[PDB]
Structure 1
Amino acid sequence: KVFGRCELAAAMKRHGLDNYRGYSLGNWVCAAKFESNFNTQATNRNTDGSTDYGILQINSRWWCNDGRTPGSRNLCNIPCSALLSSDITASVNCAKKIVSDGNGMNAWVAWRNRCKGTDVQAWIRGCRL
């Protein structure tokens, strides 16, 4: 899919991301145009060799099973292709918990710099919800 700004965003409040886990819904959206630029089809491997998966850009080394990753902990325990599909009904569960392991958004690197100290609340604006 190719999501536009509003139409790729209202879904968090649909998946329980609004005001969720101490992170208000909006802190979350700005990274989205910093992670896949509203595309769940954007993916790469890395200089670490782990491959990434979805708009989410998740690495096959610590989180899931693409199988080319040995020693991949894969705590999620679900096929990586389960995210990349434009339909996002289930894709958020693992992305939900990743902040509960105690680092929060420290999992997410861009958000620490491209949305931190920046007004993210400005990003989630303009959409009725």
Structure 2
Amino acid sequence: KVFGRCELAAAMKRHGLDNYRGYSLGNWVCAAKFESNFNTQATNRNTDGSTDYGILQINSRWWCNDGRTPGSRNLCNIPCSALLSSDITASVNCAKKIVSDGNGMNAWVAWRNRCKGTDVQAWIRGCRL
């Protein structure tokens, strides 16, 4: 599913991401835009052999099992395919674990480089929330 901006903001709010670990909703919407273009089916392979999955591009070395990333840890206890669903629940629940891991949203490279320190409120402007 390719979400609209406000549609995704509302879904993320319902699943408890607004101000989760102090990160306002716009941060999460911004991260999703630049990680996946709001597409739940996005995948991208990395040089280390791992793959990133879903709307928040969650990595198979640490967080989910895809059956082809040797010595990976599956910390979210989910198959990586679950992160591609039109239902974002699995992605959100795993993202909550990642953002609590010590480095906050810096775990998402696109957030660090394109969202951090910007007016992220713009990403939820106009939306009925």
- Whether these two folds match at TM > 0.5 is yes
Where in structure 2 are the equivalents of 1:1-129 lying within 5 Å? 1-129=1-129
Aligned-pair distance for 1:43?
0.6
DSSP-derived class of the 2:44 partner: coil
Pair 1:90–1:59, CA change in 2 (3 A): closer
Pair 1:40–1:17, CA change in 2 (3 A): same
C-alpha deviations, 1:87-107, integer Å up to 9, x for none? 223331111111111110121
Alpha-carbon contact 1:43-1:53 (below 8 Å) kept: yes
Alpha-carbon contact 1:38-1:55 (below 8 Å) kept: yes
Aligned length: 129
Question: Which structure is richer in relative contact order (CA contacts within 8 A, separation 6 or more)?
Answer: 2
C-alpha deviations, 1:29-82, integer Å up to 9, x for none? 111110111101111111221111112211211111111111101111111111
DSSP-derived class of the 1:44 partner: strand
Whichever structure has more strand as a proportion of its residues is 2
Q: How does the TM-score come out when normalised to structure 2? A: 0.92
Alpha-carbon contact 2:4-2:38 (below 8 Å) kept: yes
- Over aligned residues, Cα RMSD in angstroms? 1.3
Aligned-pair distance for 1:2?
2.1
Alpha-carbon contact 1:9-1:29 (below 8 Å) kept: yes
Percent of residue pairs identical = 100
- Alpha-carbon distance in 1 for matches of 2:115, 2:98: 18
Aligned-pair distance for 1:84?
0.2
Unaligned runs of 5+ in 1: none
Alpha-carbon contact 2:65-2:78 (below 8 Å) kept: yes
Unaligned runs of 5+ in 2: none
Aligned-pair distance for 1:22?
1.3
Residue range with higher mean Cα deviation, 65-74 or 17-26: 17-26
- Alpha-carbon distance in 1 for matches of 2:104, 2:125: 23
Alpha-carbon contact 2:55-2:91 (below 8 Å) kept: no
Structure 1 residue runs of 4 or more that deviate by more than 6 Å after TM superposition: none
Alpha-carbon contact 1:30-1:124 (below 8 Å) kept: no
